[PDB]
Structure 1
Amino acid sequence: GEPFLIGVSGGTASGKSSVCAKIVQLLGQNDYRQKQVVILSQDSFYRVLTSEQKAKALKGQFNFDHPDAFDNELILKTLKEITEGKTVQIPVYDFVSHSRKEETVTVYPADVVLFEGILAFYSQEVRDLFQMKLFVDTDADTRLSRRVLRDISERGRDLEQILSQYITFVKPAFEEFCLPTKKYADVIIPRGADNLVAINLIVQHIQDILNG
C-alpha cells in the first residue's frame, strides 16, 4: 500500500507538462488535502545559486538544463519518503533571488504521484523509485519550433539569444544527459499532448489503480 510513482521524461517542449496536466484534468483531480493524484516538477528542485552562479545567470551563461543545476540529493530524499508514505515539503524556488523561499508547499501521500522532468531518469537511484517510466518523444526540430514560439509569445525573449542558448546549453544537455535515458522508459508516448489515445490509456490505468 504505497504511492504509485510514475516518472515522466522527454526533451524540452516535447509536451511533458501538458501530458501530465491533461491527465489530472481528465481524472478531475484539480482538494489538496485529499487529492489522490499529484504532480511533482523537477523544476521545483533547483539548487541555490552562489553569487558567482547568480551573476552568470544574468549574463545568460548559466546552464539550467545541466544535472548540476538540480538538487539530486533533495529529489531522492523527497521521492523516497513519498514511496514510504510520508508527507513531504516541496520547495518553492524564487528565481529572482535564485534561492528557496522559506514558505514551502505541502503534499500528502497520494495514491499515484507523477514526477516530470527532463533529467528524471538520469540518476539511477531516482530511476529505480519509479514503478512506471514514460518518455514523451517528439522530433528535435519539432520541439525547437515549439520552444521558440513559447519563449517569444509567452516569455518575450530575444530570438537570437533563444537560439544561441539552445545551441550552447539546451541541445547538448539533452543529447548528453536526457536522450541517453530514453532506453530506460517502459512506454514511449510520441507527439506529446495531442496523442489522446496514449493519454486515455494512461488515464484509465490510474483510475484502475484508484479503483483497486
Structure 2
Amino acid sequence: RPFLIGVSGGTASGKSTVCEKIMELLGQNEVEQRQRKVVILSQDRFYKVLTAEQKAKALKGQYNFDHPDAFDNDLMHRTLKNIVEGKTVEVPTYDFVTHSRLPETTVVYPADVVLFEGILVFYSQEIRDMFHLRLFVDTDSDVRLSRRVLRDVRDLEQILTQYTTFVKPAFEEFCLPTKKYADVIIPRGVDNMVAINLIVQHIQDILNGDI
C-alpha cells in the first residue's frame, strides 16, 4: 500500500485512454480528486521548464521532447518516492502551448492504487523497481503516428518533420527497448476490453482487500 502500476508504451499507443477507461470502470471518475482511491499520474506533467534558448528551438520545431533529459527526473523520482511513502504530493501542470508549467499545482492525496503512465516511465532502474506491476501498451508506430497527427490539428509539416528527425529515433533508442521490462503487454489499447477488465478486476481485488 499504495500499489503502483506503471504503464508505458509509445506516444498515442493508448496509455492515457486505457488508464481513463480503468478509472471509468472503477467508477473513480464520479469522485473528486481529494476523495479518490485510484489515481492516474502522467510523466508528461514532469517536463522540464525550457530555457530561452530551448524554447527558441521548440518554436522552430527543433527540440526533442522524447529524450530522457527532456524530463525533470529528479522531481519525478521524488514525487513517486513520497507517493510510495503514503504522502500528499503537489504535482505540476505543463502547457505545450507555452512550453512551461502553469502557476497553479495539482494536489494528489494518498491512493490505494496509482496508475503511472509515461513514454519513459521504465527507463530508469530506480523508478522501474518501484512498480508492483508493469504494463506496456503495444501499438504499431504507423497506427500511433496516425492517432498523433489527427490528435494534433489544434500544422502538418512541422508535426511530421519533427516526428521523423526527433521522435522516431528517440522512441526507438530510449522507449522501445524498455518494453523488455514489461510484465504484461497489452496489444491495441482501449479496444482490448478483456485486458482492461483483467486489470480492473485485479485493482478491485486490491481495493476489496482480497489481495
TM-score w.r.t. length of structure 2: 0.94
Whole-Å separation in 2 of the counterparts to 1:29 and 1:16: 17
Is residue 2:140 matched to residue 1:139?
A: yes
Alignment-derived partner of residue 195 in structure 1: 192
Among 159, 173, 178, the residue aligned to 1:162: 159
Is residue 2:107 matched to residue 1:129?
A: no
Deviating runs (4+, > 6 A) in structure 1?
none
Whole-Å separation in 2 of the counterparts to 1:180 and 1:94: 28
Displacement of 1:178 in angstroms is: 0.3
Runs of 5+ consecutive residues of structure 1 not aligned to the other structure: none
Whole-Å separation in 2 of the counterparts to 1:189 and 1:95: 28
Q: Give the CA RMSD over aligned residues.
A: 1.2
Residue pairs, 1:1-212, within 5 angstroms: 2-30=1-29, 31-152=32-153, 155=154, 158-212=155-209
Aligned length: 207
Cα 1:167–1:97 change in 2 (3 A) is closer
Give a deviation string over 1:125-162, Cα, whole Å, max 9, x none. Answer: 1111111110000112121222222223xx2xx22222
Displacement of 1:65 in angstroms is: 1.2
Whole-Å separation in 1 of the counterparts to 2:119 and 2:78: 19
**Which letter does structure 2 place at the counterpart of 1:13?**
A
* Percentage of identical aligned residues: 81
Cα 1:101–1:149 change in 2 (3 A) is closer
SS at match of 2:62: coil
TM-score w.r.t. length of structure 1: 0.94
